[PDB]
Design a binder for this molecule. Structure first.
Ligand code: HEM
Ligand code: HEM
Lengths: 787, 787
């Protein structure tokens, strides 16, 4: 038979199975397939040829193709995986056909090895993901200018599928608007142009919005140099420019250097604004852990959405952040999401880098560029030094308040200068011991060592008075004040001091600002009682409750009377017998020293005159002006008025002017005081001048009394180190014809020591304790002399 | 036999041709394929079934196969366009097999259609062309992470195509430098990521080049949700990487806020780095006109140079500048030039906006917000007020220089920190009366009010020393220098002074990297001449070429010469006859304060040795040492050494010091004076003691004699108080044999004016003008007394 040699020498594996599913034929092509030899399977069940794992399902196909023939179908050709005798599940092309061999229902199966074309199909399967995956849409056109294949970017960019765009003109697919009318002419010209070309089109999506597309056509010929294909690519220019301006705006915002979470939120907001129908949010990396960096308020869930992840990497190293964007299906094309993701990721890397650099910068900056002052870093060391040296530091926290008005009105450009002006006033005001710092924003710190209550009640006042007059901006005033808290304690660490200072600083502002306070309620009480005492002193001068007392002075060599001294004296049921060691500085703080001294001298004069008018006389009275410092320009005015109140008898009066030199700062006092001698008052001095030999010890000044203070005589009896200077002062008195008085003496031994040196007047608890205004007349009417 | 039905009833197209090209077998499948009938086909030439246009060569192919053997190929297969009997042409897969009957040559043809396969092949060529048309590389990776496909972009940009790349790891396929930034591990891990990711990598071409690829890996899953393929896209981030570096650098710049011109220069540097041989220019817009803000310095001639412009607009879109890029003709790709235009323009946009704001506020700002120092306008108003008041200042143009080191190494932030550090030194050292501002950039200006050349040079030298110490920052201290220009002219405007000082600073900076001078060299020579004089004094004191004069003091009583006072002199031929009032301050300036005094005392002791041999019995010898300013660092040891040098006990030697100088350090000074007491060396204090008047009487025993200054003795007509000074001295004089010395007597009338006051010693020109070293014996022999 002719069919015998052709079947025998054939390159396709032909096999036949009887109606009972048993095989009866094989060939060398079948041997190239499977692997079994002919005799191994001739007359045996087909199941052995069937794959071992496929045998359970084969009977179903057998029944379907025998009982009903799969709806009376002889067979078909298709691909199937063949498990060769070596166990390899190779791929081959199978074909089936019902046959009537021997009058029975037999089935003939043809097989062909298909490894090579299977590899071609693998190439195509990779190439389809290579085409769907792409940065821009691309579609190839046959000689008749019909769309044949497209990509996922094309589909998601124009709302079209391959089924919808198959075999149809690009313009017919993207039906163009009639406005302008030349769009059709231009697109035809470009599409039918035989050479590579580019142009711009105004396509409108199947689902809506217009896109100003930039389309390009390129040719591809064949061996015969004939038109084989024309590849057309629709690069986006509308959304492409949207991403370009997205990067531009992200860089613009980042150039202002806003804080970390602000940068994250800005990036998220803009990313969503471009890739609408999505949410975005970033995570930062710290200590090898992710922390939610920023998010936009539009975090609502959207159906049919997919996540999309990227990693933030700085100049090198592990990630600095995690990028995640959830986008709803149909929101925007995948390549466009890629375009947004790359820019967002690189911009986020730069954002992380900026914060990282700012960390090391701020942590080590030793001066804040605004105001150029020291900052927290320097203040930390300048407080650690003091705390470890154990010298009690005092920390004031200043807060500028009522500032936001300038920021709102003129803007930051002028609000910065407004702060700098006050900071410069601080510098012009402060002193070498003090240290200044600007910790953050409108908050500053002052470090001091002098920590007396009366010192702080003045430093705080200076700091708060710095801003009395308004700040001049644009020649227009803009007021400000300060809330200043004072921390002062021993032992506690700088951290405790700063915490307390900030507590007080915020507390003052919350109460209303424009003020100052200590941290300690007890220390605040202290000043409350001080203020009450000051008001009481005001009322006291008003109501004439203070008095004066007299300390007798005697000629040390004879026992005759020499003078009396007017020691101020305060009496009060609310506070008992306060001493001049405490009630004078209160008068200085309250500014009533003027009335204090006025009443003192006035009552001294009135007592002197009312005793002169009676049958009693005394050598003189000495009022110590230096105690209240009596240093205003009315220094002679007050005494002149008081003396004129009852006539001028300066010869009967003495005055003490022990300002360290009384001319070291104000020469007007000296130039005007000569009226005292003109009236006859007895000038007196305690200290010894320094410069120019104390102005040649002012022989021109008619000094009368030289007073050796209490301490000198108190310490004299022990040491010749003081006996020598006592000798010198007494000798110079005796030589320059000056009367020397000693303001202290306790027991007979001190008086014995002072006797030999020829001291002229001695006063102290020895001769007579101070005796009030009511019975010193009795003492003088009784005792003369006292030795 | 089944061999007949095996083919006769087959559905696959089958034909057979014998040696004579006659069709011997033609199956019903072949009938339904071609359209002929079996009877019409059998016995006819095979060419009838061949396409008419291809028939002529078919017999030639058959003859070639019959004769040449063709390596006895058993069979083959392919697709060709079959022509049917009706003339229609279709694509039909087919295969050829070689069979032999009766020992002759026969050929068997098998045929199927697979027209959908031809359509898929058309789709496959289309996929290849679609992916290959775009220049972005894409590759596909099997599950095991082996690259299994490539495209034209990848092969062109990496050398390896698929053939030499398939079936191996991408990390090995892609070679990297030796872990420059740990690139190997990053590539390995990213290649192993299971979720979509993207990073950057250095990859070296076949030749070997440092190119950067933005590897972007994405997975593709199957229908059953398993990892199926890994497709990645290496976008060549080289232009993109360059823009990344550009953005980072310019972001760092704009954050650090450099000056506007340096910002433009940085922009130009980056622009030329990304575009070699570029003549880029930033034509900003000022007052509606294009102003050259900056440009790249490489303006070399270019043939048909490519020119482009980018528009710089504010937030509202109004034009504000033009980035004009000029480059080699067509040397820049459109896709990359577009970005170096847009991104650079949009980053410079905020620079321009901030600069416009700063320019609007420039005429009004009063405080530079980087150093806190007053800006140019404050200084201008201050100098205007000073000149209106007729105050000529000295503009210490402190040109803080060498800052370029920190600028190039650590950048603008740490440059500002160093500037704040140096202004900290200036602020702490400047005296209250001085003023300091910042005229521009790094040029500070410290306005003072010192006209003395000595004070000016002292301020310059102390500024130089305070800047000399390394300026610590970031634990890498940098040395810094100053170029202090100075000027001083009465009645000249601020413009005159600031032009002069600026020109002087420029002149000195040009002549050297450090120094300081005046403008108008007419007076700059003063520093050089005084320095030469200082060197000459150094030489003279080292050589011991000075001289001494011995002025005697004559008793106001009837007596012999009380003593001598030794006064150091100097006589040189070149520098003139230098007086004491000149060289003593020069001695302090040059640092021989202790050395000159040591010479003075040594000469005094040697001359004491010389005198005693003759009848010169040395009543007493005072060697001053007050104007020479002995410090405690060298006083006791050196002053005492001269005592033993020639055997003269202190009973005649005398030193002098002012208590105003003793008060400099009260801790130890007079201890050495007591050592001198033990040695017998007397101490004659100055005009009078300072405060407390006691150290001049106890522990120390001065007032062995005390001297009255000539300025007072000759001015007694107004300084009449020196009479009381004399009597105060007389007190302790009669106490323990102490004495006064009125120095400066010039007439017998002054002698009468003094002697009435019981002064014991008279000195001055009148009784005896100073005598040369060797005439003391003559004066002694001649005058006893003169009266
Ligand atoms: C590697 C060996 C084999 C494999 C992998 C295999 C697999 C399959 C599978 C999965 C089907 C379901 C329908 C389809 O896939 O098209 C099928 C159908 C069928 N199989 Fe097999 N089979 C093998 C061997 C054979 C052989 C040699 C025969 C000989 C007749 C056979 C008899 C049939 C029949 C008659 C059908 C009906 C298909 C139709 O009518 O379209 N099987 N085969
Ligand atoms: C549509 C029908 C046919 C077409 C288009 C066609 C075309 C061709 C062409 C162009 C060749 C040259 C070699 C090559 O292309 O690889 C060839 C070779 C050949 N053809 Fe055909 N042919 C057809 C039908 C047949 C048939 C039915 C037979 C039956 C035996 C046959 C026998 C041969 C032989 C023996 C060769 C030699 C191949 C070799 O030596 O490698 N041709 N054919």
């Amino acid at each position: 038979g002719i069919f015998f040699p052709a079947l025998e020498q054939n390159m396709m594996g032909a096999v036949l199975i009887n109606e009972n599913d048993e095989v009866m034929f094989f060939n060398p092509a079948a041997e190239k397939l499977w692997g079994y030899k002919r005799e191994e399977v001739i007359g045996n069940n087909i199941d052995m040829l069937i794959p071992r794992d496929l045998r359970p399902a084969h009977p179903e196909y057998i029944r379907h193709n025998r009982e009903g023939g799969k709806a009376r179908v002889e067979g078909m050709s298709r691909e199937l995986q063949l498990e060769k005798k070596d166990g390899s599940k190779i791929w081959t092309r199978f074909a089936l056909s019902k046959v009537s061999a021997e009058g029975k229902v037999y089935y003939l199966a043809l097989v062909r090895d298909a490894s090579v074309e299977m590899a071609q199909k693998e190439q195509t399967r990779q190439l389809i993901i290579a085409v769907d995956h792409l940065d821009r849409p691309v579609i190839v056109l046959d000689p008749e200018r019909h769309i044949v294949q497209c990509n996922r970017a094309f589909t998601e960019m124009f709302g079209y599928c391959i089924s919808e765009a198959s075999g149809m003109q690009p313009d017919t697919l993207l039906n163009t608007p009639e406005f302008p009318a030349d769009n059709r002419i231009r697109l035809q010209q470009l599409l039918w142009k035989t050479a590579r070309d580019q142009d711009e089109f105004l396509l409108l999506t199947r689902t809506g919005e217009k896109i100003w597309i930039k389309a390009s056509i390129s040719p591809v010929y064949d061996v015969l140099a004939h038109l084989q294909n024309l590849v057309m690519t629709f690069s986006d220019i509308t959304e492409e420019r949207q991403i370009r301006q997205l990067e531009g705006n992200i860089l613009a915002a980042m150039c202002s250097s806003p804080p970390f979470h602000e940068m994250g939120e800005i990036i998220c907001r803009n990313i969503e604004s471009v890739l609408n129908e999505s949410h975005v949010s970033l995570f930062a990396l710290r200590n090898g852990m992710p922390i939610h960096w920023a998010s936009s308020s539009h975090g609502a869930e959207i159906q049919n959405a997919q996540s999309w992840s990227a990693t933030i990497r700085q100049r090198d190293g592990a990630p600095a952040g995690i990028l995640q964007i959830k986008t709803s299906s149909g929101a925007e094309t995948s390549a466009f999401i890629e375009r947004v993701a790359d820019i967002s990721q690189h911009m986020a890397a730069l954002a992380l880098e900026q914060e990282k650099s700012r960390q090391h910068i701020e942590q080590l900056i030793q001066f804040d560029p605004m105001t150029g002052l020291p900052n927290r870093n320097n203040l930390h060391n300048y407080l650690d030094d003091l705390v470890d040296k154990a010298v009690s530091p005092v920390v004031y926290l200043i807060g500028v308040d009522h500032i936001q008005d300038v920021i709102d009105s003129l803007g930051y450009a002028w609000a910065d200068q407004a702060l700098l002006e006050v900071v410069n006033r601080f510098r012009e005001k402060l002193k070498p011991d003090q240290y200044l710092c600007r910790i953050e924003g409108t908050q500053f710190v002052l470090v001091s060592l002098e920590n007396d209550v009366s010192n702080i009640t003045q430093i705080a006042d200076e700091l708060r008075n710095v801003v009395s007059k308004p700040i001049m901006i644009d020649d227009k005033p803009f007021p400000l004040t300060l809330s200043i808290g004072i921390s002062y304690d021993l032992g506690k660490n700088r951290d405790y001091l700063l915490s307390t200072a900030h507590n007080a600083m915020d507390y003052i502002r919350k109460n209303g600002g424009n003020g100052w306070q200590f941290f300690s309620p007890a220390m605040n009480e202290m000043v409350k009682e001080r203020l009450v005492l000051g008001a009481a002193l005001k009322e006291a001068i008003s109501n004439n409750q203070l008095k004066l007392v007299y300390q007798p002075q005697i000629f040390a060599e004879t026992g005759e009377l020499y003078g009396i001294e007017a020691l101020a004296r305060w009496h009060d049921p609310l506070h008992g017998h306060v001493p001049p060691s405490r009630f004078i500085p209160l008068a200085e703080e309250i500014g009533e020293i003027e009335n204090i001294g006025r009443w003192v001298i006035a009552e001294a004069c009135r007592q002197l005159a009312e005793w002169r008018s009676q049958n009693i006389h005394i050598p003189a009275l000495s009022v110590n002006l230096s105690a209240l410092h009596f240093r205003s320009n009315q220094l002679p005015n007050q005494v002149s008025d008081a003396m004129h109140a009852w006539g001028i008898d300066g010869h009967q009066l003495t005055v003490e002017i022990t300002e360290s030199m009384m001319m070291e700062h104000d020469t007007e006092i000296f130039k005007r005081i000569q009226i005292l001698r003109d009236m006859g008052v007895g000038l007196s001095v305690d200290d010894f001048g320094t410069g120019f030999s104390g102005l040649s010890r002012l022989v021109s000044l008619p000094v009368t009394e030289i007073k050796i203070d209490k301490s000198f005589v108190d310490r004299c009896l022990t040491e010749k180190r003081i006996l020598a200077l006592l000798e010198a002062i007494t000798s110079i008195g005796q030589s320059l014809n000056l009367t020397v008085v000693a303001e202290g003496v306790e027991t007979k031994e001190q008086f014995e020591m002072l006797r030999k040196i020829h001291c002229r007047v001695i006063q102290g608890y020895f001769f007579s304790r101070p005796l009030p205004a009511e019975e010193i007349p009795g003492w003088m009417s009784s005792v003369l002399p006292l030795k």
